[PDB]
């Protein structure tokens, strides 16, 4: 959707030719932030509409400065699928063998 503001008044319209791009990091080549317990999950209640959280990451620092070992990542440097309205995305994943959680 496209948002135009004239004076203190916004108009929302569809942009039919705009695209969204999506990829999975399957080779685990990015800093992995899902293992820290963050907001931005899918809501527990199915009727709630949620905002997607912004991706960011940390690398090595000394104070506020960075060292030469610090790494910068461009997410554009991955291949990703582009989607207009009418395109969909899917993938499958296999969990590796993990012990049963003990629910007793």
């Amino acid at each position: 959707k496209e948002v135009t503001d004239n004076n203190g008044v916004k108009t929302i319209a569809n942009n039919l030719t705009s695209t969204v791009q999506v990829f999975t990091d399957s080779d685990y080549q990015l800093p992995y932030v899902l293992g820290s317990a963050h907001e931005g999950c899918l809501p527990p209640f199915p009727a709630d509409v949620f905002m997607i959280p912004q991706y960011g990451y940390l690398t090595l620092n000394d104070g506020s400065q960075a060292v030469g070992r610090s790494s910068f990542y461009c997410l554009e440097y991955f291949p990703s699928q582009m989607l207009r309205t009418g395109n969909n995305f899917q993938f499958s994943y296999e969990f590796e063998n993990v012990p049963f959680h003990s629910s007793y």
Binding site: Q29, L30, P31, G68, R69, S71, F72, Y73
Partner: protein
């Protein structure tokens, strides 16, 4: 703990000895072990061939990384080279850790 690859069955020990060569024994029998030997030593060549398996870097890091280098600046000697007297030396310890990975 000093570093490297721990193994239950490491490369085996390779033991070498010059076999003793007696000097002239007496002409009457004596039961004592012979303590008199020909002075002797050996020389040769050794080859050791090791095959090493490598694990390549897959990184998506954008910026260039730290690498081990020689320094261009002029010096009396070349590092990791022979001396003017013929003495090879290793000027610095070199570890393996230059490339980076995510944690």
């Amino acid at each position: 703990l000093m570093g490297g690859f721990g193994m239950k069955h490491p490369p085996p020990q390779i033991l070498i000895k010059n076999t003793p060569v007696p000097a002239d024994p007496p002409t009457a029998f004596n039961k004592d072990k012979l303590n008199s030997f020909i002075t002797q030593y050996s020389t040769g060549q050794v080859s050791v061939e090791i095959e090493w398996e490598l694990q390549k870097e897959n990184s998506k890091r954008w910026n260039p990384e730290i690498q081990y280098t020689s320094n261009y600046y002029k010096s009396n000697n070349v590092e990791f080279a022979v001396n003017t007297e013929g003495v090879y030396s290793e000027p610095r310890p070199i570890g393996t850790r230059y490339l980076t990975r995510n944690l």
